[PDB]
Design an enzyme around this catalytic site. Sequence first.
Site, mmCIF file in Angstrom:
data_model
loop_
_atom_site.group_PDB
_atom_site.id
_atom_site.type_symbol
_atom_site.label_atom_id
_atom_site.label_comp_id
_atom_site.label_asym_id
_atom_site.label_seq_id
_atom_site.Cartn_x
_atom_site.Cartn_y
_atom_site.Cartn_z
ATOM 1 C CB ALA B 65 -1.023 -0.038 1.126
ATOM 2 C CB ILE B 66 3.683 2.018 -2.169
ATOM 3 C CG1 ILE B 66 4.268 1.164 -1.469
ATOM 4 C CG2 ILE B 66 4.391 3.171 -2.885
ATOM 5 C CD1 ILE B 66 5.256 0.340 -2.366
ATOM 6 C CG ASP B 152 -2.941 -6.166 -7.114
ATOM 7 O OD1 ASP B 152 -2.000 -6.710 -7.114
ATOM 8 O OD2 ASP B 152 -3.661 -5.582 -8.109
ATOM 9 C CB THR B 186 -2.049 -9.330 -22.694
ATOM 10 O OG1 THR B 186 -2.559 -9.754 -21.368
ATOM 11 C CG2 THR B 186 -3.272 -8.936 -23.533
ATOM 12 C CD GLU B 244 -1.137 -10.037 -15.437
ATOM 13 O OE1 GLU B 244 -1.518 -9.295 -16.292
ATOM 14 O OE2 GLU B 244 -1.844 -9.951 -14.111
ATOM 15 C CG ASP B 267 -13.759 -5.152 -12.056
ATOM 16 O OD1 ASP B 267 -14.925 -5.092 -11.782
ATOM 17 O OD2 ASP B 267 -12.820 -4.566 -12.447
HETATM 18 O O1 URM Z 1 0.510 3.601 -6.508
HETATM 19 C C1 URM Z 1 0.618 2.245 -6.358
HETATM 20 C C2 URM Z 1 0.342 1.259 -7.492
HETATM 21 C C3 URM Z 1 0.479 0.207 -7.084
HETATM 22 N N1 URM Z 1 0.480 -0.207 -5.891
HETATM 23 C C4 URM Z 1 0.351 -1.717 -5.480
HETATM 24 O O2 URM Z 1 0.447 -2.493 -6.613
HETATM 25 C C5 URM Z 1 -0.673 -3.427 -6.848
HETATM 26 C C6 URM Z 1 -0.811 -3.498 -8.309
HETATM 27 O O3 URM Z 1 -1.505 -2.039 -8.959
HETATM 28 P P1 URM Z 1 -2.784 -2.084 -9.354
HETATM 29 O O4 URM Z 1 -3.740 -2.552 -8.525
HETATM 30 O O5 URM Z 1 -2.996 -0.449 -9.618
HETATM 31 O O6 URM Z 1 -2.992 -2.695 -10.862
HETATM 32 P P2 URM Z 1 -3.916 -3.913 -11.544
HETATM 33 O O7 URM Z 1 -4.219 -3.244 -12.920
HETATM 34 O O8 URM Z 1 -5.137 -4.197 -10.625
HETATM 35 C C7 URM Z 1 -2.686 -5.164 -11.754
HETATM 36 C C8 URM Z 1 -1.865 -5.334 -13.033
HETATM 37 O O9 URM Z 1 -1.170 -4.056 -13.454
HETATM 38 C C9 URM Z 1 0.011 -3.693 -12.804
HETATM 39 C C10 URM Z 1 0.593 -2.278 -13.456
HETATM 40 O O10 URM Z 1 -0.502 -1.375 -13.185
HETATM 41 C C11 URM Z 1 1.065 -4.878 -12.993
HETATM 42 O O11 URM Z 1 1.298 -4.959 -14.213
HETATM 43 C C12 URM Z 1 0.452 -6.098 -12.256
HETATM 44 O O12 URM Z 1 1.676 -7.103 -12.604
HETATM 45 C C13 URM Z 1 -0.842 -6.517 -12.975
HETATM 46 O O13 URM Z 1 -1.517 -7.541 -12.124
HETATM 47 C C14 URM Z 1 -1.653 -2.502 -6.129
HETATM 48 O O14 URM Z 1 -2.874 -3.256 -5.571
HETATM 49 C C15 URM Z 1 -0.804 -2.116 -4.758
HETATM 50 O O15 URM Z 1 -0.711 -3.288 -3.807
HETATM 51 C C16 URM Z 1 0.491 0.664 -4.728
HETATM 52 O O16 URM Z 1 0.695 0.463 -3.424
HETATM 53 N N2 URM Z 1 0.664 1.850 -5.087
HETATM 54 MN MN MN Z 2 -5.236 -4.295 -8.422
#
Ligand code: URM
Ligand code: MN
EC number: 2.4.1.40
Lengths: 288, 288
Positions: B65-66, B152, B186, B244, B267
């Site tokens: 959680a950043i 996530d 993808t 991923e 989702d």
């Molecule tokens: O500012 C931030 C950004 C991220 N995070 C952390 O990273 C996790 C993944 O990012 P997100 O859920 O946006 O992507 P999704 O689209 O749901 C998840 C997907 O897309 C990612 C890029 O945005 C990667 O490619 C990942 O590998 C893929 O599964 C998020 O749940 C936080 O635990 C954080 O703590 N602060």
């Molecule tokens: Mn996510």
Amino acid sequence: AIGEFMVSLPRMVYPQPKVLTPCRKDVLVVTPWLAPIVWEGTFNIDILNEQFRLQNTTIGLTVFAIKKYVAFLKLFLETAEKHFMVGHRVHYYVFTDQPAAVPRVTLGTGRQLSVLEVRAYWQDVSMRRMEMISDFCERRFLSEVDYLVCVDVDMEFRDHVGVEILTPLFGTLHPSFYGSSREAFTYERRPQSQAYIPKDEGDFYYMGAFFGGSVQEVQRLTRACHQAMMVDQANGIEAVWHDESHLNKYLLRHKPTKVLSPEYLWDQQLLGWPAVLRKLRFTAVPKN
Amino acid sequence: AIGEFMVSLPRMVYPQPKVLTPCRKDVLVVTPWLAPIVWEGTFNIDILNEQFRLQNTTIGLTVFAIKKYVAFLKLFLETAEKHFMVGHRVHYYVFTDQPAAVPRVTLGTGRQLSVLEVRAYWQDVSMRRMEMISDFCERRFLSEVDYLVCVDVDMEFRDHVGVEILTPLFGTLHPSFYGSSREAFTYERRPQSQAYIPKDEGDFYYMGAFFGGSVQEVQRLTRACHQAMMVDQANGIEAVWHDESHLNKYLLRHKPTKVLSPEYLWDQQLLGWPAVLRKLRFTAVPKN
Ligand SMILES: O=c1ccn([C@@H]2O[C@H](COP(=O)(O)OP(=O)(O)C[C@H]3O[C@H](CO)[C@H](O)[C@H](O)[C@H]3O)[C@@H](O)[C@H]2O)c(=O)[nH]1
Ligand SMILES: [Mn+2]
Ligand SMILES: O=c1ccn([C@@H]2O[C@H](COP(=O)(O)OP(=O)(O)C[C@H]3O[C@H](CO)[C@H](O)[C@H](O)[C@H]3O)[C@@H](O)[C@H]2O)c(=O)[nH]1
Ligand SMILES: [Mn+2]
């Protein structure tokens, strides 16, 4: 080797598994404790062969041929050479009271056979296989093989029996009972026996003629069954189906991590060739 | 504890599994390498709870959680308390650049939360989760938990997520691709990337948002992905879907021992509630 660092699989070309298409819709392919039930169509043997060869897996196969049952060894071993773990390392352990009656069977490369002499002979005889596998061969199996497979000798291989069966602990569905309700299972029903299972318990009826697993788990099973049979002997009771009754009790309380379908233990003379069996892999030979 | 002596299950009364009756006929419930695919109806949670409680299993849950994503922690943790491994030992590891923004969430007995401060911040940021799970937390996780679950934060639990998922290595089917053919996945398609997968390879498209396993296997996966991402960075390429893409390459070459259905990563706003999903267990929260 089991449980050690696993190198990457190489690139392979094979049909994509499709989430919205079952391999088999006519049978249960996973137990309620998430153990696969092994039927034809559920596994890609090329993937599994790769996984197990990358670990240089060695499989031990135990078989007892005492008194007149030495007659069954030639067909058992010759058909094992055609169908059992071909391409993998195999060590056969033939337990017999007649070492000179063991047939000279030609083996493929990477395969070996040891003749282990045991005593001729009834209560110590009933416990013989479980005692022998546990008490006397403990150290040898741990040093020599990764998995143990423990089978009846009055049998022949007709089709592939391979690494799809390997797992920490497996039993095999008895061919006569796979469609039966648990109340009809021939479990030991007397509460005075260590093998006792009440009428409202039981997942499956496993046959004593084909079980196995990692060496550690097979030694745990065979030790527990041997100890339980000794308790019964001391209490003047012999379970209705002998070591099979105890095996069933053990596998009720210690769930197997795979279950083999009746493809792996069939009697065609008795039961024919039903639609649910796409292959008859390991089958009864007449013993009259 | 994993892999240690397993005591007997107690007597249990539950419905008999029937060999000629599948749990689910509408979906694939086992992969071609004999890994269960976890759907509702395939497991008896009472049996599994018994097995895992008898081992005093401890599950670690990592979550990052950043920056603005600290806002998601309250709902994530409060719903985890309602639905994640209830009755088992749980250790949450919350990695954040803002320790003071972690909400004070009331935990059930046998559950604990550690706040681990990490740096704010793009290429080292992309590798952050894989690097953090492997390089910095290696020793701590080995000492504290049996399994790691890596998810996530932009998510909420709506229904049971329990020990049915636990296994040496698991991935989760991406909710957008479970019905897709492999050519449409993808995956990274440029041969210059370590994550490269050709159009004729691939089992599934796994989502980076929910994977796990034993501590040893998760550290192997995260180390391999981190190393592969570093190679890509050195070669001036970033995989199309970042960690991923690498996770998918790893799980192609190192098959998972369970696969979670999209019940475990859904989702509803995007994809609704299709007939094949009997439960929506862990679901996307809007992140606009
Ligand atoms: O500012 C931030 C950004 C991220 N995070 C952390 O990273 C996790 C993944 O990012 P997100 O859920 O946006 O992507 P999704 O689209 O749901 C998840 C997907 O897309 C990612 C890029 O945005 C990667 O490619 C990942 O590998 C893929 O599964 C998020 O749940 C936080 O635990 C954080 O703590 N602060
Ligand atoms: Mn996510
Ligand atoms: O003189 C002998 C007698 C036996 N054996 C050995 O024991 C195995 C089992 O016996 P069998 O196949 O007759 O029983 P099945 O009806 O096919 C197998 C079943 O019945 C057994 C009693 O006869 C037990 O109850 C067993 O637990 C159960 O599965 C046999 O294959 C030989 O490897 C031997 O070497 N010499
Ligand atoms: Mn027999």
